[PDB]
Design a protein around this nucleic acid. Structure first.
Ligand SMILES: [Zn+2]
Length: 289
DNA sequence: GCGCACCGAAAGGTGCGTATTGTCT
């Protein structure tokens, strides 16, 4: 699954806390990606300090803060979060059964997808009143891999935070024209899927493909999957309480179901959580081969 | 965005809207 969220000033708090579900993780969880990142000397582990600066449009070398041209009647844009989420059975196999190669499978599929997102990076340039749209082919991306859902289910996902910055052909840094990435969300989600399937196939898993063109590991069925999808069950209950058909809900109804069905939830011992997953998978009769 | 009005300083740049699957920031 691939979703996007345009990030603004009010989101700067959560964007920078994409470190938080990661210290207890149990697996290089932060990583820079992008030609733009390379250009800026950014490599490997994401530095929290510099991420904040970049979020704030401070390239900090010699140059001025980006995005002054942002109107005051409108929201400043700090980046673009592309959140890649594995199918449940995949998280299960990676995080309960403990298969590290699946983590790498996931990471590669994200990295490869992001490169295709990067080919789509654009900026504007106005010359003498004439505006041109330029493909810059470069993004600055801080990637934050996470392992758990808001209900503490195994949930392998990565937040690819695209900074609102790109380097034009004339060497000038500009806000990203995000159109081609945003409107390509579904196309990018299918690239993540294809690359992930391919990776899992090389590890020797068999894939069962579904209705939607999504897939799960062949040996883990739907009931097993649902026993580890608590948020899905809470959303389903929201709908049913309101007597809504999931097939035709409006955006407002969908967003309400997702946001308002959430419980207020603590942190927890991760050694203890893992053991709980494993006991839970036994209860559900899961054979991880 | 379907070229605009308002940003700061460049006869220039920005958000705006964009999206829409499930495993469910
Ligand atoms: Zn997360």
């Amino acid at each position: 699954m691939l979703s996007h969220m345009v990030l603004t000033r009010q989101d700067i708090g959560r964007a920078a806390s994409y470190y938080e579900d990661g210290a207890d993780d149990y697996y290089d969880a932060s990583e820079w990606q992008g030609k733009g990142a390379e250009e800026l000397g950014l490599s490997g582990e994401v530095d929290s300090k510099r991420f904040r600066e970049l979020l704030a449009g401070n390239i900090g070398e010699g140059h001025r803060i980006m995005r002054s041209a942002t109107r005051q009647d409108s929201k400043e844009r700090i980046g673009l979060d592309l959140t890649f989420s594995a199918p449940k059975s995949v998280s299960l196999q990676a995080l309960v059964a403990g298969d590290a190669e699946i983590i790498k499978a996931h990471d590669r599929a994200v990295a490869r997808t992001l490169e295709q997102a990067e080919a789509r990076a654009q900026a504007r340039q106005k010359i003498q009143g004439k505006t041109r749209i330029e493909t810059t082919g470069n993004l600055v991306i801080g990637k934050f891999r996470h392992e758990t859902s808001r209900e503490r289910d195994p949930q392998l996902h990565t937040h690819a935070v695209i900074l609102n910055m790109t380097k034009r052909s004339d060497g000038q840094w500009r806000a990203l024209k995000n159109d081609e990435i945003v409107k390509a969300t579904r196309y990018l989600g299918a690239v993540y899927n294809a690359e992930l399937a391919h990776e899992l196939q090389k590890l020797g898993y068999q894939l069962r493909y579904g209705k939607d063109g999504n897939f799960d590991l062949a040996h883990i069925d739907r009931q097993q999957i649902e026993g580890f999808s608590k948020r899905t069950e809470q959303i389903a209950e929201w709908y049913a309480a309101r007597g809504l058909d999931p097939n035709s809900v409006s955006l407002e109804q969908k967003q309400a179901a997702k946001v308002l069905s959430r419980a207020k939830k603590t942190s927890v011992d991760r050694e203890a959580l893992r053991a709980e997953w494993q006991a839970t998978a036994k209860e559900l009769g899961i054979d991880f081969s």
